[PDB]
Structure 1
Amino acid sequence: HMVSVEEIRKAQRAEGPATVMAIGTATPPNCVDQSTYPDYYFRITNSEHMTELKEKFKRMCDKSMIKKRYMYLNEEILKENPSVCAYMAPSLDARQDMVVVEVPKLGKEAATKAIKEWGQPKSKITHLIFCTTSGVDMPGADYQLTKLLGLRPSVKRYMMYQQGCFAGGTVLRLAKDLAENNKGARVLVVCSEITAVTFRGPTDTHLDSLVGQALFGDGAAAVIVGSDPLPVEKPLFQLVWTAQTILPDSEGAIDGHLREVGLTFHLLKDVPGLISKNIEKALVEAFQPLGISDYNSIFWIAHPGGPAILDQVEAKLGLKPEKMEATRHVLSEYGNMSSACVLFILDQMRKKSIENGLGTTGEGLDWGVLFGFGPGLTVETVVLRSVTL
């Protein structure tokens, strides 16, 4: 017969739901204690004379519910790059020189761990999604990671630059379509974030910049996503349904500009209220079609943008305190790692489910939700199904 586009389409598409088959995570080695961060930060920025501001920063750090963060930046690198320690000094070239190298390097560590868990040859990776908010370059971090891992030159790449904190949801929403539309496709997904682009000295004029310095940390996370798993692959979660929305009345709530001074951060106090005001509508869109209206009966992964977002969502919906445990655990041990955070939380939930002998990767529950929150104000929703242990 003559080959038709309709015959090609039927032969090239996959049959089953996109399935998470591996999760790996990595951090820079420099662990920074939150209890002493105000002293460390005001010292390495030569800002000890700003005593009232330091008291404000101490309250921010004490309320952050962060115990520690990992940071590529250390005292030696800051002494070598004093423009990065200024509040607002031309410093983008110094910051780019760091993150164009370190972002794909950290992503390589996470990716190697995901590949090791998957247990399949890396020659079988057909698609790569690389996501960061930390620097840009051409060719991108996707190309650098392809070279570092030795993936096939014909890997289909999606380079997601300057995305922000909702993009852990965005990469899963993308991976889902890549895996489900392509028979055989195995998608490597990497989110890698390094705060060397946003770190800056303190000022009393832009207190929202200081909130960033209290919350943001470094990390990379990788997942393998595919449809129609082989018997030798080990499913962890299914990706069921996705949505992205812009919240009403949220213009300018979270803004970030890449300038000569690096990545600047603008943050309205309305963000927790905006998210908690709109979250039931997002849950109804996702769960009404599944016949689910009890949000204490699903497992939760929420981007921990800060503890006020988690507290206000929990209070608005009446989530029991157990629901945010995995989310709060990652906020505690790592801080806000922008796009990577919800992937660390998915890993933490699988890990705690195994440790406590629960019946599924979703804390013994069947259905789950993953939320990303970021610039827009954008909300990403991913509906998840757990796998039985």
Structure 2
Amino acid sequence: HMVSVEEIRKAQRAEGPATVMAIGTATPPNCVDQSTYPDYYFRITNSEHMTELKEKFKRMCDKSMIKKRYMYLNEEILKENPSVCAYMAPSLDARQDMVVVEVPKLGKEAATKAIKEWGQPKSKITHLIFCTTSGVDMPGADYQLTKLLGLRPSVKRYMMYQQGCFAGGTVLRLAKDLAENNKGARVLVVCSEITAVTFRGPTDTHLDSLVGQALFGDGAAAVIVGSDPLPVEKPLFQLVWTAQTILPDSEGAIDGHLREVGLTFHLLKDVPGLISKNIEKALVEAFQPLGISDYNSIFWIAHPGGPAILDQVEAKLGLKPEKMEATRHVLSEYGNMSSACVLFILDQMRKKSIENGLGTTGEGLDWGVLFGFGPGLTVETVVLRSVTL
């Protein structure tokens, strides 16, 4: 009998939808209270003389709706690395030396927790997606994680570098196709973000760089995705449908350049306005084929780039104020952790749904949406289905 490509294809593919079976999260230990951050930040960057700029930064922090963030960087590391405390001193080598180690380390912490929840042998992991906006190396963070966890050497890896804030959507869009197209496939997904690449001193000339110093936090999240769950596996969410789009008239709204001074952040145009103007079109594309037009009838995960995005989306669509609760909770307790945020928010929604005895992992609702927002301006959409509790 001569084996054909059509035979192989039929035997190779999975049957059912991609299913989230575990979520784990991790943060660096140094907890940074937002209410005292202007005083800490102006002191460690030797900027106490800039009293007007410090006032502007206090207003940014006060408006952020962030209570605390976790940071790998602490006073001791900043004292050892004064190039990082300047506005634009040569500092990429110092920042790389930190993040090429700490990004996979924090990833491993999140991944161990996801694997524990999943309750299967790590030898059954067939695919690894590693996503970061913090540093690059060869071999990559995917290779480093494979060694730290002792995954099979034949794990199929997808190394997603320099992605930015929409990529929590991207990794679920990729994991969906890996799980669905490959019988038995189990996909470990890790997003790990460390602000050591982007931390720098303040200047009046670049108030967009300063906004970043108020919002960005550190964290890592991991999920396990697979089709055709075993009886001993415990589904949390199904991945139903995905999209990625570039918003019209958004050119240069969010740019990030990796330079000898590290990663620099640049803002033009009105990000909250552009996202609000365009979000309904994205929802119709996702939900009109499912017969859904009431956006208060679905559970919400939105990347909290800042509070203004969430406020203007809520106001544009007339969401009840409860829809954004899980999202605002993560923003409040962790800040903007770039690609990892939306995965923290998925965990928080499951946890709150359990605590409050709701019927499903999606706050008692059946259908949900997850949005990533970032450079492009790029919007990632993922349609989700909850599981009954």
How would you bin the TM-score normalised by the shorter chain?
A: over 0.9
Provide, for residues 101-135 of structure 1, a one-character-per-residue CA deviation record: whole Å limited to 9, x for no partner: 00000000000000000000000000000000000
Following superposition, the deviation at residue 352 of structure 1 comes to: 0.1
Q: Find the residue that maps to 1:379 and give its secondary structure.
A: strand
Per-residue CA deviation, residues 180-216 of structure 1 (Å, 9 max, x unaligned), is 0000000000000000000000010010000000000
TM-aligned CA deviation for residue 236 of structure 1: 0.1
Q: Equivalent residue of 2:249, what SS?
A: coil
User: Within 2, Cα distance between the matches of 1:274 and 1:57?
Assistant: 24
Conservation of the 8 A alpha-carbon contact between 2:111 and 2:190: yes
Q: What is the SS of the residue equivalent to 1:341?
A: helix
Task: Provide the rounded CA distance (Å) in 1 between the counterparts of 2:289 and 2:136.
Answer: 40
| CA–CA distance in structure 2, aligned partners of residues 33 and 153 of structure 1 | 41
Deviations 1:304-358 (A, max 9, x none): 0000000000000000000000000000000000000000000000000000000
Mapped partners of 1:268, 1:372: distance in 2: 19
> What is the Cα deviation at residue 268 of structure 1?
2.3
Q: Output the CA distance in 2 between the equivalents of 1:73 and 1:152.
A: 33
Identity of aligned residues (%): 100
- Partner in structure 2 of residue 50 of structure 1: 50
Contact 2:300 2:324 in 1 (8 A): yes
Preserved contact between residue 250 and residue 269 of structure 2 (Cα < 8 Å): no
SS at match of 2:309: helix
| Structure-1 separation of matches of 2:102 and 2:81 | 16
Which structure 2 residues correspond to residues 1-389 of structure 1 after superposition, within 5 A? 1-389=1-389
Q: What SS class does the counterpart of residue 321 from structure 1 fall into?
A: coil
Task: Provide the C-alpha distance between the structure 1 equivalents of 2:88 and 2:278, rounded to a whole number of angstroms.
Answer: 35
SS of residue matched to 2:43: helix
In structure 2, how many angstroms separate the alpha carbons of the residues matched to 1:40 and 1:355?
A: 36
Provide the C-alpha distance between the structure 1 equivalents of 2:374 and 2:307, rounded to a whole number of angstroms: 15
TM-score under structure 1 normalisation? 1.00
Contact 2:198 2:263 in 1 (8 A): yes
3-state SS of paired residue (2:35): coil
Partner Cα distance (2:267, 2:214) in 1: 13
1:29-71 CA-partner distances (Å, limit 9, x unpaired):
0000000000000000000000000000000000000000000
Q: What is the distance in 2 between the residues matched to 1:96 and 1:348?
A: 31
Quote the offset at 1:269 in angstroms. Answer: 4.8
Tell me, yes or no, if the aligned pair for 2:87 and 2:200 is still in contact at 8 Å: yes
Contact 2:371–2:381 at 8 Å: present in 1 too?
yes
CA displacement at 1:386 relative to structure 2: 0.1
Query: Deviations for 1:157-201, whole angstroms, at most 9, x for unmatched residues?
Result: 000000000000000000000000000000000000000000000
SS of the aligned residue for 1:176 comes to helix
Q: Distance in 2 between matches of 1:99 and 1:163?
A: 15
Q: State the shift of 1:267 in Å.
A: 1.4
Count of paired positions: 389
Q: Distance in 2 between matches of 1:369 and 1:174?
A: 16
2:243 match: secondary structure: strand
User: How far apart in 2 are the matches of 1:309 and 1:199?
Assistant: 23
Q: Deviations over 1:331-388 (max 9, x none)?
A: 0000000000000000000000000000000000000000000000000000000000
Deviations 1:229-261 (A, max 9, x none): 000000000000000000000000000000000
Structure-1 separation of matches of 2:183 and 2:266: 43
* SS of alignment partner, residue 190 of structure 2: strand
TM-score normalised to the size of structure 2? 1.00
What whole-Å deviation, never above 9, does each CA across 1:75-114 have from its counterpart, x for those lacking one? 0000000000001111000000000000000000000000
Q: Tell me the secondary structure at the aligned position of residue 146 of structure 1.
A: helix
CA distance in 2 between partners of 1:268 and 1:98 (Å):
30
**Is the CA contact 2:349–2:361 (under 8 Å) kept in the aligned structure 1?**
yes
